[PDB]
Amino acid sequence: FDDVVVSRQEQSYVQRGMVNFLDEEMHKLVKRFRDMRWNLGPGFVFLLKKVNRERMMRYCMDYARYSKKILQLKHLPVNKKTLTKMGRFVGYRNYGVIRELYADVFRDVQGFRGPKMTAAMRKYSSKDPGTFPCKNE
């Protein structure tokens, strides 16, 4: 359970893979509203991206550790390519959880509007996922 050591750099790969996967799936749900021409607000999309990053941060240390772990266990190379894919895999495993949290976003804002976008929110939204804190909260 705790015999694997992962570098910050290796953690970054896992964080990016996970957040990239979740953001990609997210953008697909967002299209649902766009296709309807019933625009979800930028503040709403921001809240969704935040769900993705906070879920990744929740158990970040374990996600990175066990991603590197499984690779070693399966005798596979441990690098940016394989760690990024493990991150994406973790994102996949967590899709159900994520969808339930998006549900909370909807009722939390009492609609599809979402808060107004501020500079701070845009900065957070563009921040490299690989630079978010990585520790089990």
Tell me the domains of the chain and their CATH numbers. Answer: 1-137 (1.20.150.10)
Give the number of C-alpha atoms closer than 13 A to the C-alpha of residue 48, restricted to the C-beta side. Answer: 24
Instruction: Tell me the technique behind this structure.
Output: X-ray
Q: In b/e form, how buried is each residue of 113-135, taking b as 16+ CB within 10 angstroms?
A: ebeeeeeebeeeeeeebbebebe
Phi, psi of 25 (to 5 degrees): -65, -40
Alpha-helix runs per DSSP H in the chain: 8-36, 42-58, 60-73, 80-93, 95-108, 119-126
> Closest by alpha carbon to 51, among 7, 3, 91, 1?
91
Do residues 128 and 52 make contact, with C-beta atoms less than 8 angstroms apart? no
Contacts of 72 (CB under 8 A, 6+ apart): 4, 78
